[PDB]
Structure 1
Amino acid sequence: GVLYVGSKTKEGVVHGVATVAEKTKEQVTNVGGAVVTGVTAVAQKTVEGAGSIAAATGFVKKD
C-alpha cells in the first residue's frame, strides 16, 4: 500500500550507532544488518521469505 513520509525540518542533527571502549584487553565490534540512519530514515520490508540476517558474534575463547 501507499506509504507517505513527508517532512519539513530545519537544523536536524542525527547520530547513529556509537561505541566507546577503553583499557580493555580484548575487543570485538560487530555492526550491521539493517543499520539505517538519517534525518529522514526509512526501512521497509527488511526481511521477507526464508531470508535471515544472522548478525551473530561467535566469541569462543576455547581456553
Structure 2
Amino acid sequence: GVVAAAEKTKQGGVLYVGSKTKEGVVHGVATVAEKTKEQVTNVGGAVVTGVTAVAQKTVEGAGSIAAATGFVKKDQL
C-alpha cells in the first residue's frame, strides 16, 4: 500500500514588470517503486536507477555540461 503525492490547493494602478516569472523550475515529481528487484553489475560505466531533478536558470561556459545523468566522458585531446 504505497503512494507519493504533491498537491497545491487554493480555496479562495498595479504594474507587474518582469514579475511572477518561473525560470528553470522543476515542480511536482512523484515516484513509487514496490517489490522491484534490481541487479546492477557495472564496470567502468555509469548506471542511474534513481530520481534526478535539475533546475537551472543559466549555465554559461564553452564546452560546459549543464545537466548530465548517466554520463561516460573519456575524451582524448
TM superposition score normalised by structure 2: 0.23
Residue 21 of structure 1: how far off its partner (Å) = 0.8
The share of aligned pairs that are identical, in percent, is: 100
The Cα offsets for residues 4-43 of structure 1, whole Å up to 9 and x where unpaired, read as 4799999999971110111111299999999999999998
Aligned residue in 1 for 2:70: 58
Structure 2 unaligned regions, length at least 5: 1-12
Of 7-16 and 32-41, the range deviating more from structure 2: 32-41
Q: Distance in 1 between matches of 2:74 and 2:35?
A: 23
Please give the TM-score of this superposition, normalised by the length of structure 1. Answer: 0.26
Aligned residues: 63
More strand by share: 2
* Range with greater deviation from structure 2 (40-49 or 17-26): 40-49
Shift of 1:57: 3.9
Structure 1 alignment gaps of length 5 or more: none
Task: Name the Cα RMSD after superposition.
Answer: 11.6
Return the alpha-carbon distance in structure 2 between the equivalents of residues 42 and 26 of structure 1.
25
User: Which structure would you say has the larger Rg?
Assistant: 2
